[model samples]
Target: DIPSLAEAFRDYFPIGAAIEPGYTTGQIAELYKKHVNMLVAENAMKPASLQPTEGNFQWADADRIVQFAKENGMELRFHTLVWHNQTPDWFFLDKEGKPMVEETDPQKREENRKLLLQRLENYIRAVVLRYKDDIKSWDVVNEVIEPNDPGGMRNSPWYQITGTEYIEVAFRATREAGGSDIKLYINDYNTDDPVKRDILYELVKNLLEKGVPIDGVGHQTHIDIYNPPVERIIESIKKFAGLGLDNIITELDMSIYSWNDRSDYGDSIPDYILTLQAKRYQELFDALKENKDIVSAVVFWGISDKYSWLNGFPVKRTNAPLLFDRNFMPKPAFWAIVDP
Candidate 1:
């Protein structure tokens, strides 16, 4: 029998996987129950999926996974409450039904800002209160930092309208609505990059100085076989831990392709490439275990290679980037982490 990943890492932190509601059945469900002890709704818990329209919540799919986690005794992390992508168009519309623009007119700008903040608070409160009893941790705002952007922030609608105030509003709303026990996190990707990491650090530091109720930071950790030396990742975990905040590897995955590669590996990936991935997983997990005192959880983006988002991202190419292969068997990467 294969080693249970959750048990293997139990001394370090809870091992988790992001899953779709459909994965709660059949062999995938069996594999999940055997390995992972924590769950995050892969897409079901996002703003688009939960409340596509104002006051209209589509909870059928999200509820299914919540029920699954409760039944199996798995800890649930809510994917996100606010994000740039997958949010509804109505959020960006103004009182006259026009798209809310950055207005030079002071009156118009203030109007738009107030309207957006109210909507944000309402949305966060609704989602948090609904699942407050079931979920303990939540990604309150996602992907807000961009080192290359003019002010080191992504120019999403949230930023254009509220200018960092949205982050405070979202966190305050979540804390007020979800009560004291809920852990609120600011989650982002490419955090291993030193430049981006510093920008995120400054952002979090400023928020804490203002007494924002942020409980943690989530490193998406979507890395590859060669880049982002594992030491840099541990450095980031330690850097944040020094701020008295928890850290979680929220969407961890190791893509087989390098950053510049565009070639498709087709039906078969080379065995040597898989070996490099295995080694990468081994080094990363070793670092994680060594610094387990700071990190609370490690969640893979997907349970298996077959359903990984890498299959279509960057380019439409076959990508094997998870612990299990297409047929649900453990890969060398799995053994590396499990045994190392």
Candidate 2:
């Protein structure tokens, strides 16, 4: 039998897949064992998913995912610890159920800020400590950098309540709770953008200077067919690794369709688009392998095009954005990585 993707890339880097809670079934388990070495929760571990309300933690789905990964001898990687998206509205509200809106009184705002910070830190410690032993690493903070912002810091509730110190707090808390063994990462998308990359560099550099226990940076490489030339992607990896950080291709998927709009291509994509898609996947793997020493792991966002988040994103399109087709058949993109 031909070697699986995990076996093929054993020497280069760990081969990873993002799996949902539903994939704990027998068939998915077998697929994971055959190809994937690293496992990440696609959604079950996110804030809103894990902890829907304050001080009330829901661990059923996440626990099941972790158990499944363990049984398959896969290294479990937690999806995210802190993110602006997928968070409950009450997470930003006062004890008396008031939102932290800009108020006329400065002291009230300051008091609310302190309260939010405490709440945020407490939540981090609880979650990290629970899975510290089983899970190998965490996307501790995700998508905090905004491309349009001056400092590239997202205008998120965490930042608004805790300021830029929120990033530091996340790393510090993760370190304290998970200890030094568990890897910690700050993840984001659009790294191929030079302006965003520069801002990310500065933010990470500042974190390191402040002695935060940041183990790596995660580049969520969700690229379209046209933008973010392969060279720029490799450049970002090199730049982050140059700073002594493990660079992870966290959420990788390529869409045949464009962003900012969507269209249904029915069941089949045109042959020309598939050819281009395969080429892009090949170029990316080649670039990653070229920097194999620093580029740590590449985790596809979905196992197949059928479940790719791109299908329902930016207005839902029938886009094939993965290495596999609907029936779990390996597409050209799969061979582009395995046989390159």
Candidate 3:
């Protein structure tokens, strides 16, 4: 029998898988039940996923995931309450239906602050209170660090309206609503990118020192071998661990092709690519094991490559960035996690 991924990692930390709500059926459900012990909602629990409009809430899909996790003895992590994407069109608008943009007038900017703050508060209260007991942790804010921007803060309405104070506000609201019962995390991608990593480190350090009540940092390890090598990832994890905060390897996957190269290579992966990917996975996991004390979770972004977001994101071509192949069969990469 193939060993349970979660059981294999039992001494280190929980093994997790990012799952769409619909995947809790048939063979996927069986795989989830047998392998992963932690559940992360891929898109079902995001701000836009549950709350499409202001004050209106829908929970059919998210609820299904919650029920599955609860019934199956799995811990659940709600992915992203304050992401800039997947948000509704009305989120950045005033009552008069005017879009809230960066304003030259001080008063207009202040108005935008009031509108966004209130909405943020209400949304946090609604979602957090509803699932406080069931949810073990949350990515309270996601992708707030944008390297191209000044200070590495993403210039979304959240930042434009509230200034950089919005990150603090988001964490505060989550802590207020969840009240130390839930682990609040700020998750971001490319933390392996040194430029973004340093800024994120400083931002998170400021949040903690300012009494923002953050519990951890989620390193979305959407990485490739050529860029942001495993050494960068280890260094980033060590930096956060030094801060006395929990670390989670969230949204983890490695692309078989070069990060810049997008030429389609068809369905069958070259043996050389598979061998290289396997080696990378093993090295990465070994590095993570060296710092296992502070790392609470290591989650793959999808159950299988077929379900990976990489297939449709940032201009899609065929890519294999997961342990399981398209057919849900374990690839060479799967044993890297299993044997190690």
Candidate 4:
């Protein structure tokens, strides 16, 4: 008996949810069809999930989600192609089955770099071409920026072995394989922090200057109820749009707990906290509507509170950070976004 979120925001941007394959059926599927217009596989499309082994590609789980999206008439976004986490160990191994390190001899390091880049190209080409017609966009390289690092790049295995060159390779391979019709994006979290924001901005600006086929930026807006005011989020979208690139709220979720709060609320979150969460959601959606021209889509990290990753992240405590509650009923946060 509630407004369909996708219809409510249809004039602005598509409302999306990152979901597991299980959500494609049963009561949850009904809820998704009613509210969501776009879908992203929460983990099924990641590097590890798709190709855990070097050459072995697993497509059953991801294919199911893709099939569901196609049947439901929902647009699909691929999570990522290259990331430091969840990738296989063999990706960073040498011919003799040794760990590749930056501190190794120059000749050995150069060889590893070439080998890694080749593997990256092959992986991206395969994945992108497999679903070129199905997926609308892709997060080519994820979480590549690190504010604490000297160059604002995470010193991940990919970085250490191939430096930032891997980013260009990934994008080029995707563009070549998927063609120009598919949108390419670089996705990251903490983009609202001023320091991190500027770093990401400079990085993207440089990439675009070099004509990297990056068509958009994906802000993994995993914020909290207290910090990162709505203005900051809007600022990021505007800043990225300034470069003539599209912006998408890839993983939009507002955690009930603030940064540095370690206390566990056990199973029940206080009523006041839920109210604040609703207010936060309202403020965020309002900002999003105002800047809808640049923001193409807004995707929630999960469909419901029951399956939210916040349940165990940072600490083991109950967290309700989605539109639907544990029983799949709409929460106050849902009304705030719908009614606003």
Candidate 5:
């Protein structure tokens, strides 16, 4: 029911990844910078730089990544200057390590809130404005929804205090950065659930009506290979699209595995499994091509199986879920997307 996948992704869906360590950081930056449309440094850039508990900004590593991408003529996408993880110990606390919760003391809460907002605004303005014309988009905020355990849950300290406004701070900061061109995205995993879909839908609806200064939504389709519903996932895409926002299929991987009563486990692949995996990918691509009306781009979480989070995810299952295999070899999925 869909058109050719290549047409849907000829310009977008270009390959990319987070920067890897031990190798040359510049080289890692250049690797993705060369082939991909956008680049983001992983934990190398974190909330501390964005909202340093002490309020000091270090533009070295982040700037290096920006410069590298610029030199390579690659568009830059900062993968979250604000996330719950990789946070400094002080970002969530007062001088006494007390939480940044909205407390009953109105004056104190307002002061703390103002200070936090100032710091956030400053960071977003500085970083974004510095490369405002260069970087194409930014994740702005990452992984705000905590759907359930064994799937994906919120684990960072910011979630412990400010709830979801901490997520909103990233957007507000981007607004202060004074740019209208850089596309802002709120990214999360498991957007296929009915409840989760409704929650996201309502949130985006309210945010748009209230003028939340946000741009797009990222649905992380980390699918279950053995039990994937290509149609069901397409239905999910339609649900988000109805909100009238640019839809980003961020962090996608339909993995191949056999789940037991224990958990998903990577097993020896027979001919059937390989065929199923390829068929699943084609179906998803078919849906993507069909739904290009709302879908902006379909982004794979990692480059290949070697760097993929599949092998150690969901109670540790070795997964061959991506286009490239562990040895960086293109599998049937890759060829299906490429050779087709």
Candidate 6:
């Protein structure tokens, strides 16, 4: 167990990654070299899913991703099929004469409401029903409703039109589509805050009471060493356990900035970044490995810093958020993670 991470996970030797398609065919072949047994593609999968007929289907990159996983002896996880962000522009249209998701017009909003429900049902049945047994799990709905915090989705339009009912719709669709084995997860960020925890608490309680068939709650622990609230975040995990639902730490990664947002955008790598990254990652993983009961899965946001969302996202372009650097080279944080 000391050298094998698979010994720690309750399931198979499951270490998955979010892959960037830019990997040359040679690199894709070498993806198996690291002994990684689970794989997930980027947002490309979402746009690919929407390309086929509304009710019909086509695989595209999804097929390539799955084939690679199967060839490499890895498990596959579908990133997201239904989300307001990265959706087909046509999906926002309503049956009435207005846009499904619009602003400054209440009439347009009502039209969007109907479109939302129908499209959601169609997409779920089409996607989940087809891959009923292929995928180990589906995010089902990713960050649909925002927590009462400011980390992510604090002001998303989906939350505006559907309020929190979007969650009910997504979970119900998964159950109705013959997804009995599927684990439906509602993922969110900023979970360590008490206000956000309480919101998720109340929302989940209401759903369970209504027999919504929810299976799990995903906590996005994108902590940085500068503000690595590992203890506080674990508490949130314990609180959700009271709901009696499976808990997963879906996306786990940390930036090593102590108190500087200045380097977030520049390309210059800080001298202490590598050591700080490794220590921070090790600390967070140790915390999660110790609390396996509530933390069913721990996935890094991306396989390498080269393809990480943190680069162009909430943080600017500082490149030390992960174990591998922008060139896919292992930093000091490398062995800390792979060293069983």
1 or 6, greater by lDDT: 1
Off by over 4 Å in 6: 1-13, 21-24, 28-35, 47-58, 101-112, 147-157, 258-260, 264-268, 314-316, 338-340
Once superposed on the true structure, which residue ranges of model 2 sit more than 4 Å away at CA? none
lDDT tens per residue, model 5, 163-228: 456666778778667467778888776677776766666766777777776777777788855665
Q: Compared with the true structure, what per-residue lDDT tens digits does model 2 show for residues 1-340?
A: 6459889888899888999888888665667778888889899999998789888999999998889888888888888988999988887887678778654478888888888778778988888888999997789999999977656789887887778877888889888988879889999999878999989999899889989889898999999777789999988888988889998899988988776555778776888888788888988888888888987788888787768888877756688888878877788888877886
Against the reference, the lDDT scores of all candidates come to 0.92, 0.85, 0.85, 0.90, 0.64, 0.66
lDDT, model 6: 0.66
Measured on C-alpha atoms, candidate 3 has an lDDT of 0.85
> What 10-residue stretch in candidate 6 is worst by lDDT?
1-10
Better of 3 and 5 by lDDT: 3
TM-score of each: 0.98, 0.96, 0.96, 0.98, 0.79, 0.84
Clashes of each: 0, 0, 0, 0, 0, 5
Q: Which ten residues in a row have the lowest lDDT in candidate 4?
A: 95-104
Q: lDDT winner between 1 and 5, please give it.
A: 1
lDDT per residue (tens digit) for residues 21-99 in model 1: 9999999999999999999999999989988887898999999999999999999999898899989888988877888
The predicted structure with the larger TM-score, 1 or 5, is 1
Which TM-score value belongs to model 2?
0.96
How close is each model in CA RMSD to the real structure? 1.0, 1.4, 1.4, 1.0, 4.9, 3.8
Clashing pairs in 4: none
**Residue 264 of model 1, lDDT score:** 92
Model 4, TM vs. native: 0.98
